[PDB]
Design a protein around this ligand. Sequence first.
Ligand SMILES: [Cl-]
Ligand SMILES: [Cl-]
Ligand SMILES: [Zn+2]
Ligand SMILES: [Zn+2]
Lengths: 194, 194
Amino acid sequence: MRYPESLLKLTRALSRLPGIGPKTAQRLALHLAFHKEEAEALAEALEGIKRVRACRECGNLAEGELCPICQDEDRDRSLLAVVESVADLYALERSGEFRGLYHVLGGALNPLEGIGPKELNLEGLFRRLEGVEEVVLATSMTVEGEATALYLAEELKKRGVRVTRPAYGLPVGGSLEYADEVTLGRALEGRRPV
Amino acid sequence: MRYPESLLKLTRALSRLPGIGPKTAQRLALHLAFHKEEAEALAEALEGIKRVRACRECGNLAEGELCPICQDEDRDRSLLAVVESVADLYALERSGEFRGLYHVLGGALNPLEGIGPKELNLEGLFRRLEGVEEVVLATSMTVEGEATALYLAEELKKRGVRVTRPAYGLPVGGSLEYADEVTLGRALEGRRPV
Ligand SMILES: [Cl-]
Ligand SMILES: [Cl-]
Ligand SMILES: [Zn+2]
Ligand SMILES: [Zn+2]
């Protein structure tokens, strides 16, 4: 469709973003061209995020050295949560049921994609076990996240610390009829007294 | 969810974009933070589009003064296409069945939103009728675009030039069963010999 170079340069850059097809790229590029003020603000914010980097301790996004979680003094440092990504950390933190610390991996273990202990931010985890009561293995509830969990569990039980896994089960407001048979089966097996 | 300032500043700027909710804003903001090279390229392209502006004659997006269409010498200047937006011009131009010139309005007539002749790039149209055989009223096929068409038709027939409207009808690969009754009714009324 497009022909001006800076417009096409913008549309092409917008298309590199994940979950942004060429049709959305064009609509946004046109919009940015017709709203100079907004486009300048976005360029300012993009320059602004050059500073941001992985936290020295977590792997969580941080202004400068330490992330907001690590440099919070009101934090139960007896608790630690292993997590695959920053998006998952935010979800956990948004839940409100956790005031521990986090360790952010680079992803999950995956033999089929050659992803293993060296590729993940893993060796850093074992250096931070000082006065850590509990480690929550809060990896994804997938084949890959479960494989990661079992590996961390084996390695953590060796080094003398208890490990817990968040519950498989039904989601809140969920009907039994529309849940899958595996999730439903785990929910039954992990049923609790009341 | 988020707490670092430049990240939030980016996520907030990304949310100002049309058809971008806060969940997508966050995913993209995180992605840009973890891909410094790509983010710099987007900032470069955003700075790059400061130059872009409305064409002196069309209202179409242009590098500097004139749009690529207006400064193309192989252009049937006997033909002119009135259009509501640049997105529509590109669609028309992508169709391949038009080698005329374009006039880009700022939108369509809409009494309910106080949108009328002064608010649209309209007065500029009548200055460009020199050696113009045909004007294609290629506004949207809506209540607003039709109202715009009729107004331009009245005003153009006064100033001595024929006007045409693109066809209402069925789309290519379309079944009759799933088409709406109005579109189907127009397709029948505008049926052609073969
Ligand atoms: Cl798309
Ligand atoms: Cl969303
Ligand atoms: Zn941290
Ligand atoms: Zn032009």
